[model samples]
Target: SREPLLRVAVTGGTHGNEMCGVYLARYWLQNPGELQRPSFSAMPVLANPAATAACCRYLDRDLNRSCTLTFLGSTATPDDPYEVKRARELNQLLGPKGTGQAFDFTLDLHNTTANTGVCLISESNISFNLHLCHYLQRQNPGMPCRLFLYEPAGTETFSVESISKNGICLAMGPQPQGVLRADLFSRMRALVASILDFIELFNQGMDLPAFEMDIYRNLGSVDFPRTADGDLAGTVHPQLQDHDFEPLRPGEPIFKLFSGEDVLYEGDSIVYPVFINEAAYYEKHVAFLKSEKIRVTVPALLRLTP
Candidate 1:
């Protein structure tokens, strides 16, 4: 086995209102001692400074969705929107263009209005990613941290997490965009420390124990109830509200109309839904995402080095 020096980036504020992440970025920047490692260099970045300053999602477009390869390498005019320019700058700062030789890993922190408590999402179910998630879950078994494998099939992978193969998105909440919860913040801090511990163990050539985990594999997404003209016709049913990551049976109520009618789930099999009625997804039209429960075995001796 070969040991590779790790270059890790911890990013925040791609969505300005996710105060927990933004403040964490600030805290790390002001106190870098907590980020140092014997075999890694952990860097902190406020990904969207302008958006964070405005306390808005983005100045021109959503920064999180503007990180595709085409956008990052574009030679468009200097008059490009704020986020476009910002994305390009971030690409250079955190990456070496493409995935090759990019930062060894990245942690893109985020928050949501939906009641998704301590969610860990990765683009793929890579061994390293799974091990890292397992480590966090083991650290706080009582906190109910969920892992969502978001392997969207396409070349255009967006989000800041796309910068590296080891990238992961940490989403926590039920709290509003601009609000902060003391309990949740403490949990996030614990997660950050645990992440470094995992890296340290790998650097020292230690082996991680293998275990079976119940994870949610993304199946597809569902749109909100919309009219013929594409306007929202109903809201998430009261029964389904705040029930993120719960099983939805074929006849379960999914949406409720203002006229007091219930829209039912028509899927043939039971599915778990996440990101249910997220406030930020109102424009994206995603009411929730469908997932399937599966058991996966994590190897006992995964080599983090190349």
Candidate 2:
């Protein structure tokens, strides 16, 4: 349990090229009047301005993976990548992580080239974040909302959201990097508004009922089919290109080689795939990620203070 009133941060531009968050955060930054609430105020931050300015993902390494305690606590050299300094600065502002003084909640916004719709990622089944996910789904019935739990058993959390005491990542996709899709941009703003609204309601003592949720948990990743020369091989199969969170049967096609050959999935069970053919993940060699859908019980939220 935690205090009724909360400290919250809304971060964007973590990838810089992910325009949904970059522009949305920029919008709110200019119009701080749009961010006020009754119970608590939300801080809208432009996470990686240097990367944002250049309109690229990062100058050196990915900013999202640079937030681990091991990386942040390390000594700063005279020459650090742009993201290194930026990650440390973010922690100082909204975090110190795992501390009581850290933000009660952090919402890091991102958009991907894959067709994953309105996904909320958390480190675990944090009741607070799960409640927010359920609330978002209930509020927007037509649009599908997904919960992706990054493995929490692991001690080190790398993403920017990990800096907060509790955090939720709003990563939606099908938009190209460095380009803003009008639909996704507006949807993100509304989603962020709803999240803040829920936080306000919680602080005002509105506790939602406990419910079971089907969340997609990480299993592993599948790389793109490579050529014999280890050069380039295949593109995502037409059937799988826009399919995120869909059940991929054992024998389904995963890739379509440039030579017009289809490579099929060899896994035994029906696995759900996410970030399918993400543009950014190409460099990381991840064509899609396999996930398991498991039912989880999220407990009712309770205010810590009377």
**Number of the top-ranking candidate, with TM-score as the measure:** 2
Model 2, position 270, has a per-residue lDDT of: 98
Worst 10 residues of 1 by lDDT: 297-306
lDDT (tens digit, per residue) of candidate 2 on 1-306: 656646889999998799999998888888987678998899999999988999999888899999899888889998887788888898899788767767877899999888998999888777878888999999998889999988755788888889988788999888899899898899899999999898889888776777898999999899988877766688899999898999999888989999999999997799999999887888898999989999999886665433
Per-model C-alpha lDDT, please? 0.85, 0.87
Question: Residue-wise lDDT of candidate 1 within 96-198, one digit each (tens)?
Answer: 4585768888889888888888899988887778888888877886878889998868878788878765689999988788787888777787788788888
**Candidate 2 deviant stretches above 4 angstroms:** 303-306
Q: Report the Cα lDDT for candidate 2.
A: 0.87
TM-score of each candidate? 0.94, 0.96
On the 0 to 100 scale, the lDDT of residue 263 in model 2 is: 94
TM-score (C-alpha) between model 2 and the true structure: 0.96
RMSD of each: 2.0, 1.8
